[PDB]
Design an enzyme around this catalytic site. Structure first.
Site, PDB file in Angstrom:
ATOM      1  N   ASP A  80     -23.856  34.963   2.527  1.00 53.30           N
ATOM      2  CA  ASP A  80     -23.511  35.078   1.118  1.00 53.30           C
ATOM      3  C   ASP A  80     -24.789  35.278   0.287  1.00 53.30           C
ATOM      4  O   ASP A  80     -25.903  35.191   0.802  1.00 53.30           O
ATOM      5  CB  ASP A  80     -22.660  33.908   0.640  1.00 53.30           C
ATOM      6  CG  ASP A  80     -23.322  32.584   0.860  1.00 53.30           C
ATOM      7  OD1 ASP A  80     -24.566  32.554   0.934  1.00 53.30           O
ATOM      8  OD2 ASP A  80     -22.601  31.566   0.918  1.00 53.30           O
ATOM      9  N   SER A  81     -24.642  35.558  -0.994  1.00 55.83           N
ATOM     10  CA  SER A  81     -25.797  35.942  -1.784  1.00 55.83           C
ATOM     11  C   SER A  81     -26.572  34.736  -2.294  1.00 55.83           C
ATOM     12  O   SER A  81     -27.723  34.865  -2.714  1.00 55.83           O
ATOM     13  CB  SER A  81     -25.346  36.741  -2.995  1.00 55.83           C
ATOM     14  OG  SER A  81     -24.870  35.849  -3.998  1.00 55.83           O
ATOM     15  N   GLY A  82     -25.921  33.576  -2.296  1.00 52.56           N
ATOM     16  CA  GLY A  82     -26.526  32.353  -2.800  1.00 52.56           C
ATOM     17  C   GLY A  82     -26.070  31.998  -4.202  1.00 52.56           C
ATOM     18  O   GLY A  82     -26.189  30.850  -4.635  1.00 52.56           O
ATOM     19  N   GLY A  83     -25.533  32.984  -4.914  1.00 54.29           N
ATOM     20  CA  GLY A  83     -25.194  32.815  -6.317  1.00 54.29           C
ATOM     21  C   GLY A  83     -24.154  31.756  -6.630  1.00 54.29           C
ATOM     22  O   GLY A  83     -24.303  31.013  -7.606  1.00 54.29           O
ATOM     23  N   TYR A  84     -23.096  31.683  -5.828  1.00 51.85           N
ATOM     24  CA  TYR A  84     -22.018  30.746  -6.110  1.00 51.85           C
ATOM     25  C   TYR A  84     -22.502  29.308  -6.021  1.00 51.85           C
ATOM     26  O   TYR A  84     -22.191  28.479  -6.881  1.00 51.85           O
ATOM     27  CB  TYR A  84     -20.820  30.948  -5.177  1.00 51.85           C
ATOM     28  CG  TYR A  84     -19.714  29.945  -5.436  1.00 51.85           C
ATOM     29  CD1 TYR A  84     -18.862  30.087  -6.524  1.00 51.85           C
ATOM     30  CD2 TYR A  84     -19.537  28.842  -4.607  1.00 51.85           C
ATOM     31  CE1 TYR A  84     -17.857  29.165  -6.776  1.00 51.85           C
ATOM     32  CE2 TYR A  84     -18.534  27.915  -4.849  1.00 51.85           C
ATOM     33  CZ  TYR A  84     -17.696  28.084  -5.934  1.00 51.85           C
ATOM     34  OH  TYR A  84     -16.696  27.167  -6.176  1.00 51.85           O
ATOM     35  N   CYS A 113      -6.478  25.114  22.260  1.00 52.13           N
ATOM     36  CA  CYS A 113      -7.880  24.694  22.214  1.00 52.13           C
ATOM     37  C   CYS A 113      -8.198  23.595  23.228  1.00 52.13           C
ATOM     38  O   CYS A 113      -7.301  22.903  23.715  1.00 52.13           O
ATOM     39  CB  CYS A 113      -8.309  24.289  20.792  1.00 52.13           C
ATOM     40  SG  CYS A 113      -8.136  22.542  20.348  1.00 52.13           S
ATOM     41  N   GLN A 129     -15.298  41.692  -9.491  1.00 57.33           N
ATOM     42  CA  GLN A 129     -15.098  40.596 -10.432  1.00 57.33           C
ATOM     43  C   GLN A 129     -14.049  40.986 -11.478  1.00 57.33           C
ATOM     44  O   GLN A 129     -13.334  41.976 -11.298  1.00 57.33           O
ATOM     45  CB  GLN A 129     -16.435  40.188 -11.062  1.00 57.33           C
ATOM     46  CG  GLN A 129     -17.425  39.588 -10.056  1.00 57.33           C
ATOM     47  CD  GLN A 129     -17.049  38.174  -9.640  1.00 57.33           C
ATOM     48  OE1 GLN A 129     -16.176  37.550 -10.240  1.00 57.33           O
ATOM     49  NE2 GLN A 129     -17.712  37.666  -8.606  1.00 57.33           N
ATOM     50  N   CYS A 133      -6.946  20.026  22.381  1.00 58.88           N
ATOM     51  CA  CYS A 133      -5.532  19.784  22.613  1.00 58.88           C
ATOM     52  C   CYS A 133      -5.178  19.770  24.094  1.00 58.88           C
ATOM     53  O   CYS A 133      -4.135  19.246  24.476  1.00 58.88           O
ATOM     54  CB  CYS A 133      -4.683  20.789  21.831  1.00 58.88           C
ATOM     55  SG  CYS A 133      -4.806  20.492  20.049  1.00 58.88           S
ATOM     56  N   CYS A 183      -1.153  24.489  20.488  1.00 56.09           N
ATOM     57  CA  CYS A 183      -2.550  24.897  20.396  1.00 56.09           C
ATOM     58  C   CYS A 183      -3.225  24.980  21.756  1.00 56.09           C
ATOM     59  O   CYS A 183      -3.125  24.057  22.559  1.00 56.09           O
ATOM     60  CB  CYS A 183      -3.303  23.904  19.516  1.00 56.09           C
ATOM     61  SG  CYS A 183      -5.047  24.306  19.298  1.00 56.09           S
ATOM     62  N   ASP A 210     -24.219  38.492  -7.404  1.00 50.69           N
ATOM     63  CA  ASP A 210     -23.432  38.663  -8.622  1.00 50.69           C
ATOM     64  C   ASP A 210     -23.538  37.451  -9.539  1.00 50.69           C
ATOM     65  O   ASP A 210     -24.229  36.487  -9.218  1.00 50.69           O
ATOM     66  CB  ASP A 210     -21.963  38.973  -8.287  1.00 50.69           C
ATOM     67  CG  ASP A 210     -21.283  37.867  -7.490  1.00 50.69           C
ATOM     68  OD1 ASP A 210     -21.971  36.956  -7.000  1.00 50.69           O
ATOM     69  OD2 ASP A 210     -20.045  37.921  -7.337  1.00 50.69           O
ATOM     70  N   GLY A 252     -14.321  35.678  -7.387  1.00 52.27           N
ATOM     71  CA  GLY A 252     -13.821  35.032  -8.586  1.00 52.27           C
ATOM     72  C   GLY A 252     -12.464  34.359  -8.485  1.00 52.27           C
ATOM     73  O   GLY A 252     -11.942  33.878  -9.497  1.00 52.27           O
ATOM     74  N   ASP A 306     -13.386  33.485   4.704  1.00 51.93           N
ATOM     75  CA  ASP A 306     -14.527  32.590   4.929  1.00 51.93           C
ATOM     76  C   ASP A 306     -14.208  31.134   4.610  1.00 51.93           C
ATOM     77  O   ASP A 306     -15.101  30.361   4.256  1.00 51.93           O
ATOM     78  CB  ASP A 306     -15.761  33.034   4.118  1.00 51.93           C
ATOM     79  CG  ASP A 306     -15.524  33.034   2.601  1.00 51.93           C
ATOM     80  OD1 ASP A 306     -16.399  33.535   1.853  1.00 51.93           O
ATOM     81  OD2 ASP A 306     -14.481  32.536   2.144  1.00 51.93           O
ATOM     82  N   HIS A 317     -10.863  21.804  16.961  1.00 53.04           N
ATOM     83  CA  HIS A 317      -9.442  22.099  16.870  1.00 53.04           C
ATOM     84  C   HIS A 317      -9.109  22.919  15.606  1.00 53.04           C
ATOM     85  O   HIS A 317      -8.353  23.894  15.678  1.00 53.04           O
ATOM     86  CB  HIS A 317      -8.575  20.841  16.897  1.00 53.04           C
ATOM     87  CG  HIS A 317      -7.183  21.113  16.433  1.00 53.04           C
ATOM     88  ND1 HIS A 317      -6.221  21.708  17.234  1.00 53.04           N
ATOM     89  CD2 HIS A 317      -6.626  20.968  15.209  1.00 53.04           C
ATOM     90  CE1 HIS A 317      -5.120  21.883  16.519  1.00 53.04           C
ATOM     91  NE2 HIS A 317      -5.342  21.446  15.288  1.00 53.04           N
TER      92      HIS A 317
HETATM   93 ZN    ZN Z   1      -6.112  22.231  19.264  1.00 50.96          ZN
END
Ligand code: ZN
Ligand code: ZN
Lengths: 374, 374
Positions: free
Chosen positions: B93-97, B311, B194, B314, B309, B147, B221, B271, B340
């Protein structure tokens, strides 16, 4: 296939021995390092990772487990092995030491001890009978007799009183274990030698334990402030008092050099908490001595924690990265430090076993110390 | 072998698409969930575990990295991939947020922003040029334009001002990226739409970004307090404004149902921080909705977190065990919950991709919602 319990010595050098303990759930190579699991987890490691480091057996802390999640609950859920996902042997401590060290409002008597939980102040009880029962409910493979610990320093009178009580409790532990068929047929029971730093009391304790008869013998009451010189001095006379043909277990914390010296004195099993505790605090073990990875000198160091270590951490990540993680308080930092430190201890044990097998352990010990303390 | 960047759409259903982004470091299957790595770690997981859950790409937070361990330091050490041990694509990410959300003493201008670190109050600077430079120093594969974020709610005037500034900054970001040969030839650059909740501003923003030209287009946004109904309403008109033949990236947190609805509206990349953040707080995702594993009802529940699941968590551990670990504050609890939850999100993405490929995504979405909210 495997027996309930069989200890075989394959090779010796001086007082040092190497061999195996065979149990139903697996073989334990000795001298052994047994990583500590507190409340049903070895800190920051999946069981498969603990096994990958070379561990054959882990410890479970009875005191912690009886408080959370509870012994009866673990039994209802299928036992400790199933609960935490470790299918190899587990040694459980008796709970007594942590009662002394961690609990509040302790009331001691010849029957046992009542105490308040350090977590919520709920009231609990331990006794030889109840400790053995809890270890049964957990499904422990190696059960420890319940004893009364002796603080350091201790007067000869107090050391004698606690040792004598501990021996009475050792007999009660033996009888409780034997009266429970499933436990007697599938688990092993170790007794604990007491007597503080006093040779005569250590001898009386060894004699009492041998008369009762156990599958293994721990040296208790050390690693509690007396320092290495004194610990080694006491081990010098104490270990030869124990039956030669059974495992000798030193209970207590230890650094790599403590382990080497204890093996030189006939110890076969160790339960040191240091590698699981100090990892997240920044201490990493190396063949050139310990380092604190938080130190700024490591911020751009691309080398692994240790130059020879075969662990997965040292194959993949730099000191610089681990320095960053620990400084940042990231969980992955604790994971990586702990895996490396336990793996380091296991590689130490492997080098010890191989050197005894090859009749070059004394040389190994000298070389190890020269480099570790250079 | 692989190109710098190639997005190919293999199948469509309504506004939903499935396909691949090919980059030098690997292929990304879309729609994609990109787990968040803050300060060069995905919380409580080794990179190999992140990959095992099904992730093709992870996110790095520029703001966190520039503070600790530092962008120049990471470059000196060989870049972010080498540093943390993830060799597949990384989006930064750009760092801005985070400057807006986490930092103090912020001073904004047309040039960029100066701010004090939330860690130690040291002074820092970000600008389109410096953000792109930091992302270069990290060795990012997908670079985000820098941004100026718009809080919710925003007046039409303020939303317009910030959108207009963001578009000027998008051009500066484009030029900074292009002027750096190594970055231009090996990485990709995404622009960020935006305009708050305003259709006219969203259109102006999309037009400005398309005129500049980017490898992908984020919807910025949203997910900042407007709620799902409004977010979906804005996505309804906003996503079709973006170039159809490039990936569409929704920036922001999201639950499983947010992801499904966003894909129905043409989003290709997510994300969401929720699975990495809420795991250690007790929230586990299941096909029958979220549960909080700390709840006492799970203390003796032997079932896995989710019944279907695939994974590793599980396969091996019970709700009862994980309940205990989280209640006890054990690191392994955070490890297991996070693995998980990320794996659950990846299985959701796989079901989404397969259903779009098979022309049954609308049915999948309906079935998913009926069960998740039953
Ligand atoms: Zn799982
Ligand atoms: Zn290592």
């Amino acid at each position: 296939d495997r027996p309930r319990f069989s200890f075989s010595i394959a090779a010796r050098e001086g007082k040092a021995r190497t061999g195996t303990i065979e149990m139903k759930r697996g073989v334990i190579r000795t001298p052994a390092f047994m990583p500590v699991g507190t409340a049903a987890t070895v800190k920051a490691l999946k069981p498969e990772t603990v096994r990958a480091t070379g561990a054959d057996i882990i410890l479970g802390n009875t005191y912690h487990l009886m408080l959370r999640p509870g012994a009866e609950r673990i039994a209802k859920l299928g036992g400790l092995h199933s609960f935490m996902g470790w299918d190899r042997p587990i040694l459980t401590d008796s709970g007594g030491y942590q009662v002394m060290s961690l609990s509040s409002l302790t009331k001691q008597s010849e029957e046992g001890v009542t105490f308040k939980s350090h977590l919520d102040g709920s009231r609990h009880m331990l006794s030889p009978e109840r400790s053995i029962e809890i270890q049964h409910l957990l499904g422990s493979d190696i059960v420890m007799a319940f004893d009364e610990c002796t603080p350091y320093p201790a007067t000869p009178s107090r050391a004698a009183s606690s040792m004598e009580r501990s021996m009475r409790w050792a007999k009660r532990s033996r009888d409780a274990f034997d009266s429970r068929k499933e436990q007697a047929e599938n688990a092993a029971l170790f007794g604990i030698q007491q007597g503080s730093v006093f040779e005569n009391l250590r001898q009386q304790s060894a004699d009492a334990l041998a008369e009762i008869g156990f599958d293994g013998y721990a040296v208790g009451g050390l690693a509690v402030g007396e320092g290495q010189d004194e610990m080694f001095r006491v081990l010098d006379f104490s270990v030869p008092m124990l039956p030669d043909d059974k495992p000798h277990y030193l209970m207590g914390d230890g650094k790599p050099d403590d382990i080497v010296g204890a093996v030189e004195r006939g110890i076969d099993m160790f339960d040191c908490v240091l590698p699981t505790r100090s990892g997240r605090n920044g201490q990493a073990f190396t063949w050139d001595g310990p380092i604190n990875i938080r130190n700024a000198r490591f911020s751009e160091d691309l080398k692994p924690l240790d130059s020879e270590c075969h662990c997965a951490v040292c194959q993949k990540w730099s000191r610089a990265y681990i320095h960053h993680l620990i400084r940042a308080g990231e969980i992955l930092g604790a994971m990586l430090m702990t895996e490396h430190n336990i793996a380091f201890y296991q590689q130490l044990m492997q080098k010890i076993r191989d050197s005894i097998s090859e009749g070059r352990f004394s040389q190994f010990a000298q070389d190890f110390r020269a480099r570790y303390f250079a």
